[PDB]
Design an enzyme around this catalytic site. Structure first.
Site, PDB file in Angstrom:
ATOM      1  N   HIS A 142      -3.310   4.965   9.528  1.00 29.58           N
ATOM      2  CA  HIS A 142      -4.757   4.882   9.729  1.00 29.58           C
ATOM      3  C   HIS A 142      -4.893   3.199   9.620  1.00 29.58           C
ATOM      4  CE1 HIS A 142      -4.320   8.643   7.827  1.00 29.58           C
ATOM      5  NE2 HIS A 142      -5.447   9.160   8.266  1.00 29.58           N
TER       6      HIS A 142
ATOM      7  N   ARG B 100      -5.885  -3.749   8.627  1.00 28.90           N
ATOM      8  CA  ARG B 100      -4.339  -3.317   8.149  1.00 28.90           C
ATOM      9  C   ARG B 100      -4.108  -2.239   8.843  1.00 28.90           C
ATOM     10  NH1 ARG B 100      -3.343   0.528   3.609  1.00 28.90           N
ATOM     11  NH2 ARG B 100      -5.647  -0.331   3.050  1.00 28.90           N
TER      12      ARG B 100
ATOM     13  N   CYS C  61       0.797  -1.200  -0.039  1.00 27.98           N
ATOM     14  CA  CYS C  61       0.072   0.011  -0.040  1.00 27.98           C
ATOM     15  C   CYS C  61       0.914   1.267   0.086  1.00 27.98           C
ATOM     16  CB  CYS C  61      -0.936  -0.013   1.225  1.00 27.98           C
ATOM     17  SG  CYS C  61      -0.113   0.300   2.822  1.00 27.98           S
TER      18      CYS C  61
ATOM     19  N   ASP D 218      -8.919  -4.309   5.529  1.00 29.03           N
ATOM     20  CA  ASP D 218      -8.697  -5.140   4.387  1.00 29.03           C
ATOM     21  C   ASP D 218      -7.233  -5.889   4.595  1.00 29.03           C
ATOM     22  OD1 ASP D 218      -6.844  -2.895   4.147  1.00 29.03           O
ATOM     23  OD2 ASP D 218      -6.775  -3.140   2.265  1.00 29.03           O
TER      24      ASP D 218
ATOM     25  N   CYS E 239      -1.687   0.922   8.375  1.00 22.72           N
ATOM     26  CA  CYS E 239      -0.930   1.497   7.848  1.00 22.72           C
ATOM     27  C   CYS E 239      -0.283   2.680   8.693  1.00 22.72           C
ATOM     28  CB  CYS E 239      -1.879   2.316   6.997  1.00 22.72           C
ATOM     29  SG  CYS E 239      -0.737   2.857   5.278  1.00 22.72           S
TER      30      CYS E 239
ATOM     31  N   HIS F 190       0.600  11.214  15.803  1.00 21.84           N
ATOM     32  CA  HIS F 190       0.025  10.639  14.625  1.00 21.84           C
ATOM     33  C   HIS F 190       0.933   9.452  14.040  1.00 21.84           C
ATOM     34  CE1 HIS F 190      -2.060  10.441  10.969  1.00 21.84           C
ATOM     35  NE2 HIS F 190      -0.917  10.596  10.312  1.00 21.84           N
TER      36      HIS F 190
END
Ligand SMILES: [Zn+2]
Length: 135
Positions: free
Chosen positions: A102, A114, A62, A106, A116, A99
């Site tokens: 996300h 997932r 990704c 999936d 990310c 931060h």
């Protein structure tokens, strides 16, 4: 944040401040730890809380380091994120609110999730010797 905002601005790279403090995203496929396969723990760059173990990391294709679960339920904070003309769930460090990225539905079994995560949000501590590298 665990350190003062002044210490962070002086110790973090421009990319690391942008990502962890300003809700930024590092450019896709550029993260230092994208293709790391070594055994070890991915900690929060800011406060050093453990976030993800290497055994949960996988190559999602990704753009960013991907994991199927964090080390504990309380490790992560989940926030609704409408940035970038999208609707997503933002993940932040549960301890200092840095931060991270996300979470998406999936991912592989068993979680189907997932996570990310910007390499720039992480410090990897190598399982062979405890050596630390910033992402
Ligand atoms: Zn943290």
């Amino acid at each position: 944040n665990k350190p003062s905002a002044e210490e962070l601005k002086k110790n973090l790279s421009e990319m690391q401040f942008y990502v962890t403090q300003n809700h930024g995203t590092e450019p896709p496929f550029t993260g230092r730890l994208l293709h790391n396969k070594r055994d070890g723990v991915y900690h929060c760059l800011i406060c050093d809380a453990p976030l993800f173990h290497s055994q949960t990391k996988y190559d999602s294709g990704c753009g960013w380091p991907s994991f199927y679960e964090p080390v504990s339920e309380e490790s992560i904070r989940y926030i609704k994120d409408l940035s970038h003309g999208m609707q997503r769930i933002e993940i932040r460090c549960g301890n200092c609110d840095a931060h991270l990225g996300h979470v998406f539905p999936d991912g592989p079994q068993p979680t189907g999730e997932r996570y990310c995560v910007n390499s720039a949000s992480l410090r990897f501590t190598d399982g062979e010797n405890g050596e630390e590298i910033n992402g």
